[PDB]
């Protein structure tokens, strides 16, 4: 009811300031339900998007700087991957490594450690999703997730 209590709430208690909790030094909010299931599907290796679909999705990206990236596949047809669009979503130039939930335990010690057959190693480098399927481990509330590193 007053500018002073309004300023208190604004500066101390707004939702965004509450993203990380001191109870456990990790985020309290993650990506849940439809968005989580869908993003797991979206970032699979074989998700390809046409020009029109890409333009629509970019329609929903509030921070987009208005430049359509070069498609990952130029011929025979221009196709964007889910990872490219999601890279457009990621802020700044953050760096993060995670593993998908179905990541086999012996992959990291064999060959293909850095070229995952199942696309189960998440690598965000320079703000770009280079590899890997996103899931709760990467977008959830656990310590060291992408949302934690963004915060």
């Amino acid at each position: 009811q007053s500018l002073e209590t309004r300023a208190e709430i604004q500066e101390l208690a707004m939702v965004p300031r509450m993203i990380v909790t001191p109870q456990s030094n990790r985020p309290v909010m993650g990506i849940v339900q439809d968005t989580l299931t869908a993003v797991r599907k979206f970032t699979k290796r074989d998700v390809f998007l046409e020009r029109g679909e890409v333009m629509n999705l970019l329609m929903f990206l509030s921070t987009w700087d208005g430049k359509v990236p070069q498609p990952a596949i130029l011929k025979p047809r221009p196709l964007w991957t889910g990872k490219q669009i999601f890279s457009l979503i990621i802020p700044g130039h953050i760096n993060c490594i995670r593993t998908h939930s179905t990541h086999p335990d012996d992959e990291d010690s064999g060959p293909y450690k850095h070229i995952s057959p199942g696309d189960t190693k998440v690598v965000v480098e320079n703000g770009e999703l280079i590899m890997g399927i996103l899931c709760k481990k990467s977008l959830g509330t656990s310590a060291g997730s992408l949302v934690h590193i963004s915060y």
């Binding site: 991957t81 990872k83 850095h114 696309d119 999703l129 590899m131």
Partner: peptide, 11 residues
Amino acid sequence: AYVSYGGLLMR
């Protein structure tokens, strides 16, 4: 040399 083509990987 490892290359990522929007997540399609090459070595």
